[PDB]
Amino acid sequence: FDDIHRKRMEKDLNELQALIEAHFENRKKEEEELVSLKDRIERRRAERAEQQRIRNEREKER
Amino acid sequence: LSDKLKEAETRAEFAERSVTKLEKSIDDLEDELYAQKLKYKAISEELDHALNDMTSI
């Protein structure tokens, strides 16, 4: 019986460390990859938006 | 050719307009979408991170 309790602590603490790591790392990987990716998407969209604004001004002159 | 050009030019404009309209709605999509993309997973991810710790009692 008390071995059940020990097994529970063994899995919970192995899980705790796996989880402190997975909780943090899954977010740091997904989250930093996401902002890095979307920081670039945001910049590329802003660049394209500026280019289209310029393109629209050029057509207006045409 | 004049009519085909007007139609093609009109379509060049409409298709390019659709391209810049979609590039914009896509950017405006994706950009707002990445916000969701970056915060829905980070909020839920940090919620789950926190859960490992929230449940450490």
Partner: peptide, 29 residues
């Protein structure tokens, strides 16, 4: 809360069993 679902079962069962033991330990007289 998977951690809770199982910890919940563990503690409810362990406290209920411990309580059942507390109650019997005295109740047996």
């Amino acid at each position: 809360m998977d951690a809770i679902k199982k910890k919940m079962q563990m503690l409810k069962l362990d406290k209920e069993n411990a309580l059942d033991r507390a109650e019997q330990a005295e109740a047996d007289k």
